[PDB]
Amino acid sequence: RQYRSADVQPADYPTVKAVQSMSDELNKETNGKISIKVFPNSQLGSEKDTIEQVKLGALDFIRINSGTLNTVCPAMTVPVLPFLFRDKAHMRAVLDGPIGDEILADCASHGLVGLAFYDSGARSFYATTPIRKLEDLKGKKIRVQQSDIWVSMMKLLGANATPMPAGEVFTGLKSGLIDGAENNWPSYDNFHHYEAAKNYSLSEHSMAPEVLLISKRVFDSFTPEEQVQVRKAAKNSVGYMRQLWDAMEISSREKVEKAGVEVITIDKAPFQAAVQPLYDQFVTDPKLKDMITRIKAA
Numbered sequence: 530r531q532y533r534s535a536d537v538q539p540a541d542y543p544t545v546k547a548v549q550s551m552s553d554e555l556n557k558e559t560n561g562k563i564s565i566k567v568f569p570n571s572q573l574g575s576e577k578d579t580i581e582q583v584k585l586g587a588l589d590f591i592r593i594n595s596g597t598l599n600t601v602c603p604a605m606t607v608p609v610l611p612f613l614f615r616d617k618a619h620m621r622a623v624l625d626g627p628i629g630d631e632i633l634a635d636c637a638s639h640g641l642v643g644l645a646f647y648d649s650g651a652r653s654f655y656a657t658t659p660i661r662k663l664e665d666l667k668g669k670k671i672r673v674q675q676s677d678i679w680v681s682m683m684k685l686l687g688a689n690a691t692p693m694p695a696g697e698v699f700t701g702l703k704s705g706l707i708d709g710a711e712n713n714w715p716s717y718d719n720f721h722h723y724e725a726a727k728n729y730s731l732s733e734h735s736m737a738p739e740v741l742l743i744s745k746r747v748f749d750s751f752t753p754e755e756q757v758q759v760r761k762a763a764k765n766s767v768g769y770m771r772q773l774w775d776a777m778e779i780s781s782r783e784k785v786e787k788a789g790v791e792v793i794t795i796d797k798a799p800f801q802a803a804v805q806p807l808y809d810q811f812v813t814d815p816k817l818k819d820m821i822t823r824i825k826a827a
């Protein structure tokens with residue numbers, strides 16, 4: 530059985546290679562019984578639409594950002610929150626441990642089994658003009674993921690959110706529909722956004738990680754041994770992914786700088802102050818508020 534998985538990222542991207550590595554492991558351990566074919570580059574649809582396919586059992590696996598998954602699974606809002614993690618090492622420790630496992634377990638009741646977190650760096654603003662301070666964002670049309678938290682966030686920052694699928698963003702930057710967007714270094718590179726919006730400002734305002742999930746309907750068809758094998762292959766793929774990822778952050782930043790991008794250092798304090806209301810607005814469950822307390826102290 531060759532199961533199917535979706536990713537908006539290109540064929541050679543670390544998230545795609547990670548799931549392919551998981552497939553290789555499963556193919557070996559199950560002696561051909563289970564493998565996974567990845568369909569990259571939004572071939573199967575947007576993140577919004579592919580998450581619905583998984584809920585319906587129309588799609589077996591999905592690799593999506595938590596910043597869209599949190600439309601369905603409330604716990605996924607927690608790791609999206611701006612300025613929550615101190616740095617990459619803090620995030621990795623949290624997501625690899627009990628807190629990460631607790632968040633992944635939240636998805637099952639919604640028809641999706643959470644299997645692993647993949648790194649996504651920190652998301653930063655980029656635009657067709659240089660954003661040198663928060664005030665420079667005022668009135669700008671900034672694309673966000675199709676998830677309400679980001680609309681609220683842009684409002685607090687004085688910008689105008691335009692939610693749209695990942696595959697439409699380059700076109701919007703070239704057409705004038707949007708003035709900018711926000712993402713990590715490998716995405717700024719690999720979606721070609723740097724060609725159209727040549728000013729990248731290190732706001733580092735979210736570390737929203739990626740999530741790999743399986744349809745609950747499909748998972749439930751697996752033997753108990755197969756379920757253990759799938760979870761273990763998913764966890765093993767995190768370390769594989771991270772090695773590819775850390776190199777790509779370097780090579781992508783180098784590539785776009787060579788192409789003429791201005792990399793802008795920006796005072797984050799006004800951003801942090803502006804977005805604080807999001808925490809109580811979007812995280813209302815006492816269990817999740819306690820989780821945030823534990824994360825802040827980890």
Ligand SMILES: O=C(O)[C@H]1O[C@@H](O)[C@H](O)[C@@H](O)[C@H]1O
Pocket residue numbers: 537538576592593594596597649673674694695711712713716739
């Ligand atoms: O902004 C987006 O649409 C994209 O951002 C990337 O960082 C993430 O890897 C994609 O899964 C998608 O969420």
Ligand SMILES: [Cl-]
Pocket residue numbers: 662663664665799
């Ligand atoms: Cl300012």
Ligand SMILES: [Cl-]
Pocket residue numbers: 537574575576577693694695696
């Ligand atoms: Cl999308």
